[PDB]
Amino acid sequence: MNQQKSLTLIVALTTSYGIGRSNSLPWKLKKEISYFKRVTSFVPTFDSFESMNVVLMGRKTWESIPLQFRPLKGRINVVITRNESLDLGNGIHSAKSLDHALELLYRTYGSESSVQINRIFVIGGAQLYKAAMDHPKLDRIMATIIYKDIHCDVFFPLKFRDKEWSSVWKKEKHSDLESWVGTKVPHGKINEDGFDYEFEMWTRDL
Numbered sequence: 001m002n003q004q005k006s007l008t009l010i011v012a013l014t015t016s017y018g019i020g021r022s023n024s025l026p027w028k029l030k031k032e033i034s035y036f037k038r039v040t041s042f043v044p045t046f047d048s049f050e051s052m053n054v055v056l057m058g059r060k061t062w063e064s065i066p067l068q069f070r071p072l073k074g075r076i077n078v079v080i081t082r083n084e085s086l087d088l089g090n091g092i093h094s095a096k097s098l099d100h101a102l103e104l105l106y107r108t109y110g111s112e113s114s115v116q117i118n119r120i121f122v123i124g125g126a127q128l129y130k131a132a133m134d135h136p137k138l139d140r141i142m143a144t145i146i147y148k149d150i151h152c153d154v155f156f157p158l159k160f161r162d163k164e165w166s167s168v169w170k171k172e173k174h175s176d177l178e179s180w181v182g183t184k185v186p187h188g189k190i191n192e193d194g195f196d197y198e199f200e201m202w203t204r205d206l
């Protein structure tokens, strides 16, 4: 009814859990943003026919996307705002909260719809990340660890890779990361423009 499917969170963060600065990402990573686009766009071949993915984001995050890349193509976009004066879109939804968005999609993309939902992604920001970390359906984190203590003013809200959360959140093998995204992905450290980063997949039991 409200939430059938599992939620997946996607984030790029430093080893200090830093995620943004001055309403923007503090780094310019071309191969990294390409990975974001692949993961969030990927739907299996067979299901290719009707299925689409959803990207859920906080308003400040909506605002932070280059006018040029917005709305995010090939994906159903939904902005979470407790205050919707309006929304500047042409098939882009607004919802009051995370659950309100799930009900909107399940009502909007039912049987009368040509367009079916494949995967649901929470793309941030910190406020939305916090609500998703508390949601009983969030069981997967697609994280990119940036090994550089970049000055940030916004932080990921839960230290999921830390000892204290280690009996709940588990890092999965690289091969099932690849299997989940479909394409093979670079293993180990990637160096792009002075930054060292790596792709990880973390899961938890519901």
Ligand SMILES: NC(=O)c1ccc[n+]([C@@H]2O[C@H](COP(=O)([O-])OP(=O)(O)OC[C@H]3O[C@@H](n4cnc5c(N)ncnc54)[C@H](OP(=O)(O)O)[C@@H]3O)[C@@H](O)[C@H]2O)c1
Pocket (backbone or CB within 6 Å): 010, 011, 012, 013, 018, 019, 020, 021, 022, 023, 024, 025, 057, 058, 059, 060, 061, 062, 064, 080, 081, 082, 083, 084, 096, 097, 098, 123, 124, 125, 126, 127, 128, 129, 131, 154
């Ligand atoms: N590194 C990454 O992977 C990554 C991913 C995303 C964002 N970021 C960065 O994070 C920053 C944006 O983060 P942020 O924390 O400031 O904001 P955010 O979550 O994008 O947006 C906050 C706004 O979203 C709405 N919202 C969020 N959670 C809500 C809830 N549970 N119920 C209702 N409304 C809710 C509210 O909108 P109203 O005020 O309209 O009520 C709140 O002001 C930027 O620097 C961005 O670049 C980094």
Ligand SMILES: Nc1nc(=O)c2nc(CNc3ccc(C(=O)N[C@@H](CCC(=O)O)C(=O)O)cc3)cnc2[nH]1
Pocket (backbone or CB within 6 Å): 010, 011, 012, 025, 032, 033, 034, 035, 036, 037, 061, 064, 065, 066, 069, 072, 073, 123, 124, 143, 144
């Ligand atoms: N792994 C990861 N990396 C990120 O940079 C990221 N960013 C957000 C939020 N911020 C942004 C900022 C820009 C674009 C963006 O313009 N994306 C385009 C690709 C643009 C291009 O071709 O280079 C897209 O269509 O996905 C997306 C999200 C959320 N989760 C993330 N997750």
